[PDB]
């Protein structure tokens, strides 16, 4: 259950660079 | 056009959401070998024998480990500095009890991170920036050599290189305490002088923005909703900002001007921690911190202790323990 | 006639010597001459673990593995007494040399067996009656097998036999009992045997060279644990020698 | 290894708690009229 | 000398104590100093044999000035501190010694350093220069906003 | 504390006879262990063999006694085994064997005296300290 | 330092961690700002010396955000976009930092230490043969409070005979 | 319960007293002196040179008070593992088995 | 991008908050024995 | 049962002697004239059923004798321990300063 | 008792994850204009 539980975490977190990347809100000039 | 025309178009383009670039032909490929292996060597390699002793350390989770006590563990002290590919192993059971993993991560690391260094300096080309960027990066990049190539190179062994994880990282500073008494060197003091001194001014400099930005907001909105992305205006006051400053110390201890201080703030960590690699990679060579052992002496002889001897008693301790079975003769002289 | 330079690196240094083909002859014994062997080399090809059944009333296997720790396995310049005996029989006293090499080998789903593959002490002999040494002499023999780690080594805790810590200590309140077989280390001393085959001879230059199978105890990791059976088989080359 | 029985439960519940949160504010952050 | 047979003389590891093999099968010394079987010098080459170090050489070939040119160097071992304390970092003062090896590797470690430094920084100015952009951006003719957006 | 006549007053021979040593004296032997000796005897050890070392009690229990002047002098011209048994001027620095280790050339027997006088001086001095390594440091 | 590291482990500490990820962060922001505005600043001058080409008075911003924001999206995946959030998260990263750190050493001021991981003690206890660098720093921790206890706590009049030293072989 | 106040005595009938342990310690040696304060025995790390083993000092302990009043115990095992409990002060009997304790000291709700 | 015209407003009124959360409860209530076994 | 044998033998006469049969070689320094020429006869010539077999090492001088003769008081025998006279460890047992 | 040790953590999400995702859209209702 513990290693299930370190990649688990470690996983969700490359998934969450993924959105951060592709899906981030863009930047918009004013 | 043709192909490799447009190939290189490609490659080069400033419109692609990742930069790809020449640098990038390298870096991506390297750095996508070196983590996918990581990723798996972390997880689920077996115990490797580091020391060459045939007392194999488990660092992966499977075999044991945490994510605090879990490492890629660095390859055999009987392979020394002889290149260890893949190929070079009669099997991948081989290949792993000595720590293969562990070379081949690195390698391709340090080819992919110089690469991605390259990269910076590229990209500021294509988007018409000044070059400097990759320069700062040269030092974070520097202390990854000095700690994965630079020392294994000059102790002979890359069973000596900085294991791939949290406590791998605490034993390499501790063994190199014990081997060169790292906190003597004026080099490590500098780096201290560029982490401690970079923290001071981030925070400094933060706090002295934040604390002059000028009102474009109500109270039941965030401060950060009065910049817009692009505007042309500053959206601080740095008049004001000053003015605070160099009444805490005095005015000409404060920069008025944002450029010479946006460079102090680059110089500074930049410049430290070009010491702290160097200083890693010169312990590489022995030339050690200082040695003030006994330099103490009263009028018949005595010795009269300071705080450098607590200190060698420390590294003494650090020293007699370390590699408890790996020695067979008085002198570690690697 | 190789050097140094034209075998580094190409692991031909952890081959024993071979002979041609034509080494079909004989050498022959002078009952009233002393004999040595200049130069004995084993080279192992397979090394065999026994298998541990779960019901312990079948019969078990010696299984192959995979050697990890690379050409590293050979035991050489290995010299000692030949001695004649009354009943014309050859005995091999064996009294120095590289004779013993750690090495580890892995089973079929991973686990890992260190042993010290050795023929320290070894005393071997052939049948009697052997006025020369052909491709029809064995020697048959028994050698010590002493722990694969002495006295001094210390396990991951820092305990061990003649150093190191008695006891668990970060476990400083635990009732000592249950932890006695780690806490407590042994040296182990046990007995192998070993075969030895002519299979070629050389009786101008008194040279043999042939087969080998020996079977010994696995490392025991100083009492901790069990050893294994192993089987190792392998070539072997001497120099037969007038002393 | 023996590890802490409640060590599951609670890396769960210290995940899940916050993030969830987090969600909560983000989603009705995205519907309200724009 | 003192009796040992250090060919079979077993070491704490199981590894020999003075001899053991490389991982292609050479002869070579054991402990740490394994990982330094690469190298050759004249006071110890006459100790090689074809499969490395010879053990019949090591018991009846060993001259004195072997003995005094190998301890000469194992008291000389590029070992010390920045105010030249000579040996391990836990020595006490009474030798004063830094290798010249080490005092010209160190040197010539850091001048390369800064030299590779130097490179970047003139390399990218150069480039900027000759692009001509290396006093900043035009204002009126910045490059990024010709640009479409990446997102 | 000080360094004075009676710790610098050191047995010149086997029969009970001392020699008081001077400051410069004691200087000159520090100097010139220094320069001679300390690469393999630093502190009272001896690293290229630590069964042995410099301790007071160790050179009285040796062959012929070292724990004096004239031992020590002796040694220095004509190295031996702890038993006395072998002559070592081959792999051990001596004027027998100045060809040899060339530092040992310009050396006098003044110089040998100042040096004998620095190993009898220094325990005097330095207790356990000297002869003891790393675990007294 | 080395006190800390030989009897509380304090390198294993989370929140001594939490204090170097603040302070190695704090340096890498202040390194990467500093860097990432003096390489998109406007060309405001004719100097080839960049510095005299501002104005402490001047409306307008130094060095373009836009391009900055393009640079680090390209190269890293994200950048910042808004100015106010980066200078407040300047403030934020060193400042959290060491208030962990200091969180930690109240914890080291009853002992109250990340010293041990349990499950690693209990297999390492039953298991000879069971080694990671947990354990291995634990060895690097006793040779040090054994070697530094006598002469730095002198009150305690310590006194460890040679024989029970902790040592490996050799050294 | 209390096992009784140990008293270790050498082959000589000395009175030996175990150092304790300092709360700075998570471990600490096993080292007996005289009333001077004169190490008289320990339990050795390296055996090579040994001066002070119990064995060699002929070490051992009897109790007074508590569950092992009136016993003595002259087996160098035994003897040690009682000093080995007197660095921590006075020796008690504990029941680990209902909690499965693991034997590694918690601090109480002063601590907390 | 063109904007994806398929799209809908999603809604959960606070009665069915309260009837699911129950549900979820009372299920939970029910299964816990069984998952504690 | 289990015993670690080395301390087991430090309550023997092993922990208050020269034991002819296992001390490693070091300790004959302890006394005038042992070492290193009569040390390494000794260790090589071992074992001995009593101390006073020590005399019958073939080649010995009478002064070497005489030496020897001198020192029996500070020598014993015990069985050979196996764990202490492995791995060459009564040449070097791992032990310097 | 000696019960199911994941007991615990399974009733904890039985109730969590629906849960949360029943007070995630009932929030963004909420927040929706009118
Ligand atoms: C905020 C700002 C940030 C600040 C962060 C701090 C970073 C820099 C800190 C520098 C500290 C300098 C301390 C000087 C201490 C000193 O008194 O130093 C003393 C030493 C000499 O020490 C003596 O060294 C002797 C050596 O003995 C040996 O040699 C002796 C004879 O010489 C005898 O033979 C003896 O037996 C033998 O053992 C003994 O140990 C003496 O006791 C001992 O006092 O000076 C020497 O080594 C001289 C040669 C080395 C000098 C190196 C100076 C630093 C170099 C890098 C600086 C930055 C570079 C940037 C460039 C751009
Ligand atoms: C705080 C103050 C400093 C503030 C920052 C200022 C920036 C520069 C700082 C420089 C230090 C200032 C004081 C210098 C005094 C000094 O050095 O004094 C030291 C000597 C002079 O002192 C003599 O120093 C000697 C050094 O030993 C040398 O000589 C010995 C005796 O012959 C032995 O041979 C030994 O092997 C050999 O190393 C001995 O100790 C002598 O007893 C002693 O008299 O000056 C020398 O050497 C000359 C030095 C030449 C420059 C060094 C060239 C090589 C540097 C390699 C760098 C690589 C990495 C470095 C990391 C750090
Ligand atoms: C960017 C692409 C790239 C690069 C540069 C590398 C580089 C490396 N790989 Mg990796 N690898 C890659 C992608 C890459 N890899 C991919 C996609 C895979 C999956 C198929 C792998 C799978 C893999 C495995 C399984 C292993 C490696 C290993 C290695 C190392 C040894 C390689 C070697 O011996 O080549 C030598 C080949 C040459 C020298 C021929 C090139 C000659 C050219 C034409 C001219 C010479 C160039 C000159 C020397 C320098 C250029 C100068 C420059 C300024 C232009 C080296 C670090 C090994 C390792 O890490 O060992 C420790 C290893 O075991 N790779
Ligand atoms: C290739 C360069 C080099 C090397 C390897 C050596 C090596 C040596 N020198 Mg020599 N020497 C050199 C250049 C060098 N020197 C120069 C340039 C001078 C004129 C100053 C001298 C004048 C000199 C004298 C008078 C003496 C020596 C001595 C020695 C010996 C003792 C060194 C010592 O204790 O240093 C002490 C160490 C330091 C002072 C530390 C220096 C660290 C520097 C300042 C860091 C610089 C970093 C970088 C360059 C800064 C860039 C800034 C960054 C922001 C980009 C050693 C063999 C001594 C000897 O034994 O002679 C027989 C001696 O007496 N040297
Ligand atoms: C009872 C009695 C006697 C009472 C007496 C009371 C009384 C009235 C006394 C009067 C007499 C009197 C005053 C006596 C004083 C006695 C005395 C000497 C006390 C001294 C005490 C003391 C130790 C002072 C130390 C001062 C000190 C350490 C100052 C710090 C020095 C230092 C390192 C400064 C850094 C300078 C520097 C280059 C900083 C750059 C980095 C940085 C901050 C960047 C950030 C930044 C800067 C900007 O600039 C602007 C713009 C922006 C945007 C920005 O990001
Ligand atoms: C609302 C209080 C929240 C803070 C509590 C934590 C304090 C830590 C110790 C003090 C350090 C001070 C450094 C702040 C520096 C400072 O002065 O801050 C000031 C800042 C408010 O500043 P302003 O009003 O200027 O707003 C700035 C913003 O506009 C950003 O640009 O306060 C906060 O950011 C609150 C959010 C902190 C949130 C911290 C992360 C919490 C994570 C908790 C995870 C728990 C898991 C639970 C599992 C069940
Ligand atoms: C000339 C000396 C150079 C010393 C080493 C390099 C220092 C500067 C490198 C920092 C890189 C930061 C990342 C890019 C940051 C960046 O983009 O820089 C931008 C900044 C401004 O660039 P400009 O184009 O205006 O000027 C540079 C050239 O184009 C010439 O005009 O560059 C400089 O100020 C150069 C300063 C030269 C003089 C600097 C000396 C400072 C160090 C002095 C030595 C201290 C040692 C202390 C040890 C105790
Ligand atoms: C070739 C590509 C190479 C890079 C690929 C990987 C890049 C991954 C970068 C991080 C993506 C996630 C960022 C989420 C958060 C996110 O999307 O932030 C985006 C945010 C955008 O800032 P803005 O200024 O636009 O925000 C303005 C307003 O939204 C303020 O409310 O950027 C930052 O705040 C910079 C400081 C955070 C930088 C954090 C970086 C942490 C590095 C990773 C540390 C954990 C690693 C754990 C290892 C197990
Ligand atoms: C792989 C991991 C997957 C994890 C995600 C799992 C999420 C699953 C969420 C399911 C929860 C659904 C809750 C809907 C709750 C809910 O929304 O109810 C109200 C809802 C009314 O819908 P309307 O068409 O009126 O639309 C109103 C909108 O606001 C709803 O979105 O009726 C239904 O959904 C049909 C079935 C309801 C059945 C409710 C019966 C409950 C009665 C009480 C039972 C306990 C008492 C028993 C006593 C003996
Ligand atoms: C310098 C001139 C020098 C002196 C003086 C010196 C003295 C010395 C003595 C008195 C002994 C005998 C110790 C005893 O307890 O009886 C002794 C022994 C050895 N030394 Fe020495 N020595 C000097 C120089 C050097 C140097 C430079 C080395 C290292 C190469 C060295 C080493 C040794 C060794 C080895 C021995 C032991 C020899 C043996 O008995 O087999 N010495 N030294
Ligand atoms: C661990 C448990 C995890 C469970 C996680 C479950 C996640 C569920 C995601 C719910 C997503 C809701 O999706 C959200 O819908 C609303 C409408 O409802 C959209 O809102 C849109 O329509 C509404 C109409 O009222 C407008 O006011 C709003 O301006 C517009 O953007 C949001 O743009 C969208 O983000
Ligand atoms: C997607 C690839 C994941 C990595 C595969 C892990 C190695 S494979 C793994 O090896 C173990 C040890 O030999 C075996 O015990 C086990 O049965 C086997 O599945
Ligand atoms: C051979 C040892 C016999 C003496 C018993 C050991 C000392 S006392 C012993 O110590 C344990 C903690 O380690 C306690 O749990 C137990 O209750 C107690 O009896
Ligand atoms: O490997 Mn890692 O650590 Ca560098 O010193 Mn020598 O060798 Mn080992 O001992 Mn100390
Ligand atoms: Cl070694």
Known sequence: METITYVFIFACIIALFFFAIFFREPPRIT | ?334 | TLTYDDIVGTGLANKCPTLDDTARGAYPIDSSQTYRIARLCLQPTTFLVKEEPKNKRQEAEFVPTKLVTRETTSLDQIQGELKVNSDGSLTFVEEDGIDFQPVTVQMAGGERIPLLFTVKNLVASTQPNVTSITTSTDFKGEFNVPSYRTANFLDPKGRGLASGYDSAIALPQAKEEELARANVKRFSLTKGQISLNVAKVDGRTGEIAGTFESEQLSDDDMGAHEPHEVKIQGVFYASIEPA | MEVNQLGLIATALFVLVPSVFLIILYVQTESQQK | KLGANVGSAQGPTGLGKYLMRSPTGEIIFGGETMRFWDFRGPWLEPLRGPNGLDLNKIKNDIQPWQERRAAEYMTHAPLGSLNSVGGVATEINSVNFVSPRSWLATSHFVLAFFFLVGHLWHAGRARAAAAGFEKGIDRESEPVLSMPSLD | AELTPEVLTVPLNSEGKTITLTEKQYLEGKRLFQYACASCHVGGITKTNPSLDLRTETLALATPPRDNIEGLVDYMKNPTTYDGEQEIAEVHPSLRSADIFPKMRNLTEKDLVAIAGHILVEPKILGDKWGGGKVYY | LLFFQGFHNWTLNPFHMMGVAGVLGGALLCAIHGATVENTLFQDGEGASTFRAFNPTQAEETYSMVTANRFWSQIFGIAFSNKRWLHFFMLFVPVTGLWMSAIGVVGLALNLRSYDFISQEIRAAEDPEFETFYTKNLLLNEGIRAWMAPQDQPHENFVFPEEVLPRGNAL | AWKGHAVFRNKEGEELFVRRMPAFFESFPVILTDKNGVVKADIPFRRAESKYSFEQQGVTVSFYGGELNGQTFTDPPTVKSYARKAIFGEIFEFDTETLNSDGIFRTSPRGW | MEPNPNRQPVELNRTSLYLGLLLILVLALLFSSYFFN | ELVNVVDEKLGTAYGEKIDLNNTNIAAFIQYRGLYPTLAKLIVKNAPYESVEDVLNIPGLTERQKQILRENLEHFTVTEVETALVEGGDRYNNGLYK
């Open chain 2, 1 to 334: 056009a043709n192909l490799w025309e447009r190939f290189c178009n490609w490659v080069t383009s400033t419109d692609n959401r990742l930069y790809v670039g020449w640098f990038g032909v390298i870096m991506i490929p390297t750095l996508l070998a070196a983590t996918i292996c990581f990723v798996i060597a972390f997880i689920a390699a077996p115990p490797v024998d580091i020391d060459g002793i045939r007392e194999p350390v488990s660092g992966s989770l499977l075999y044991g480990n945490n994510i605090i006590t879990g490492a890629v563990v660095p390859s055999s002290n009987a392979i020394g500095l002889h290149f260890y590919p893949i190929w070079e192993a009669a099997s991948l059971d081989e290949w792993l009890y000595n720590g293969g993993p562990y070379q081949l991560i690195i390698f391709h690391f340090l080819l992919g991170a110089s690469c991605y260094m390259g990269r910076q300096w590229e990209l500021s080309y294509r988007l018409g920036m000044r070059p400097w960027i990759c320069v700062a990066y040269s030092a974070p990049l520097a202390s990854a050599f000095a700690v994965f190539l630079i020392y294994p190179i000059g102790q002979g062994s890359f069973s000596d290189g900085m294991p791939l994880g949290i406590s791998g990282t605490f034993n390499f500073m501790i063994v190199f305490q014990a081997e060169h008494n790292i906190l003597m060197h004026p080099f490590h003091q500098l780096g201290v002088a560029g982490v401690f001194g970079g923290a001071l001014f981030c925070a400094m400099h933060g706090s002295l923005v934040t604390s002059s930005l000028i009102r474009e907001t109500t109270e039941t909105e965030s401060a950060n909703y009065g910049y817009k992305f692009g505007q042309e205006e500053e959206t601080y006051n740095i008049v004001a900002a000053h003015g605070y400053f160099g009444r805490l110390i005095f005015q000409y201890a404060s920069f008025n001007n944002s450029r010479s201080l946006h460079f102090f703030l680059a110089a500074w960590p930049v410049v430290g921690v070009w010491f702290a690699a160097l200083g890693i990679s010169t312990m590489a060579f022995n030339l050690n911190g200082f040695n003030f052992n006994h330099s103490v002496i009263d009028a018949k002889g005595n010795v009269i202790n300071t705080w450098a001897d607590i200190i060698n008693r420390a590294n003494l301790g650090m020293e007699v323990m370390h590699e408890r079975n790996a020695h067979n003769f008085p002198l570690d002289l690697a």
